[PDB]
Design a protein around this ligand. Sequence first.
Ligand SMILES: C/C=C/CC/C=C\CC/C=C/CCCCCCC(=O)OC[C@H](COP(=O)(O)OCCN)OC(=O)CCCCCCC/C=C/C/C=C/CCC
Ligand SMILES: Cc1nc(-c2ccccc2Cl)n(NC(=O)c2ccc3c(c2C)OCCO3)c1C(C)C
Ligand SMILES: [Mg+2]
Lengths: 248, 231
Amino acid sequence: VQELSIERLLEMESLVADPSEEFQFLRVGPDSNVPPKFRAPVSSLCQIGNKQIAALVVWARDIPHFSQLEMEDQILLIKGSWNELLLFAIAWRSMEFLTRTSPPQLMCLMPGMTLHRNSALQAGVGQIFDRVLSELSLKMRTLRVDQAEYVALKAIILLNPDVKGLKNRQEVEVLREKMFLCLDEYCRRSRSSEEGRFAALLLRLPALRSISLKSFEHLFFFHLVADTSIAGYIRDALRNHAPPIDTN
Amino acid sequence: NVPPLTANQKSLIARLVYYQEGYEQPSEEDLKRVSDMPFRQITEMTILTVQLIVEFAKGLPGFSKISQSDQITLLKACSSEVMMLRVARRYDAATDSVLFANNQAYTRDNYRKAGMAYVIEDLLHFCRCMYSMMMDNVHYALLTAIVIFSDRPGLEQPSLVEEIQRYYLNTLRVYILNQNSASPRSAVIFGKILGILTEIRTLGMQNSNMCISLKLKNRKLPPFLEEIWDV
Ligand SMILES: C/C=C/CC/C=C\CC/C=C/CCCCCCC(=O)OC[C@H](COP(=O)(O)OCCN)OC(=O)CCCCCCC/C=C/C/C=C/CCC
Ligand SMILES: Cc1nc(-c2ccccc2Cl)n(NC(=O)c2ccc3c(c2C)OCCO3)c1C(C)C
Ligand SMILES: [Mg+2]
């Protein structure tokens, strides 16, 4: 676990995934309660999420010592955390569009597009829209969360040894425990003045979990997730998807 | 060398451990005092244990500082999560089961008879995961306080509840540090305990999804649970 470090995760963040072999994790089903006038916009948002999931699979693959895990464990870890990582990245990206007595109005789903709060109200997802921007985006800006802590939390989210069905739980424990050491050391060497920062950062993770669970309710309600096929998509993506390219 | 525990921190730890043993016992001999019967044993045992959580929370330093509606918000949201901790604390590795002294309601069979058998394995998995952490009564008690003062939606003064939680968080951090001689592994022990906060969010949601399932099947909860679990 010596290669696993915040510095390596920082240089991995710059790597760009090659043209994503499309895996339809999210899609507008044949019979869907999404009104017909909005199926095309919703479908485009699913295609956007699918690309980000594909970039997430390629990111997790090259994480130090991740590919040395059992292949079934690698699938379960990505299967259980891809949603939270999407929301966490959304919340990280949305900080720029914070105030660019009213709540935040814009959510950055991807670099080249934002979601307006009125579009979330029309979709009936206003509450979860506000939770992402306040409990995550606004809190991370107030917390002055830097990129080093962001990539560390992403690794901590992914390397969850409590995922049901793992065959080598301790091999995942060793990886997450190394991340706890890395995050605590970074807070002591660079953020030495701030007390309780290590705890303050990890307190976003349960908030991220609840929001992720609420999103899964909406996604399943509108029959947007292909849950019966996600593990299969993760299997093929880890094996066949092209490695990222360093822009340098 | 290693920052010692202040007198306020040692007193807080001793206070929480003392009342944890007092509210541990789902007693007052109310087991005697207090397929429909299997579901009624679960709901009756839960009411008694939830009332122990509320009295434990109302006696926590800082609970009187927040608004009344903020107290109701915290108690309504932490009740099911703390219930998972209390049941998990009674896990027995040798039998791979939950031993609650009055081992009837929270056994596998009563849950099978009441139609909630699909939930047992998700519960026992958490029991195994928490048991492997080897938390002492200080770790477990401070965690319970940290669950209660977590940031919940709808808080009128979320910053105030955060300041209260930080006092228990800092107490837990210093306790682990002193117990490990400022070893780097203090962050691992600390981080894993905070990781439980994430996992009991799922269990509390699954509990909320069963309350929804009961309403659709028209099986109703005792009104105390209906009000606290926001039917
Ligand atoms: C988690 C990863 C997210 C990345 C992308 C993944 C999936 C894409 C789905 C995201 C949708 C966000 C809302 C965007 C709505 C845009 C279209 C719109 O305005 O519809 C109004 C319509 C009014 O109709 P109506 O005729 O009034 O009847 C509909 C009644 N509700 O509303 C509808 O068409 C109903 C369905 C709308 C989509 C619901 C998706 C649920 C997804 C939740 C996950 C959210 C994550 C972040 C928060 C935005
Ligand atoms: C009256 C009642 N009491 C409980 C309960 C019993 C023991 C621990 C925690 C809870 Cl919340 N529950 N919940 C569960 O039994 C439950 C629900 C979902 C779960 C779960 C449990 C124990 O365990 C983990 C997986 O998801 C209920 C229901 C009938 C409203
Ligand atoms: Mg007390």
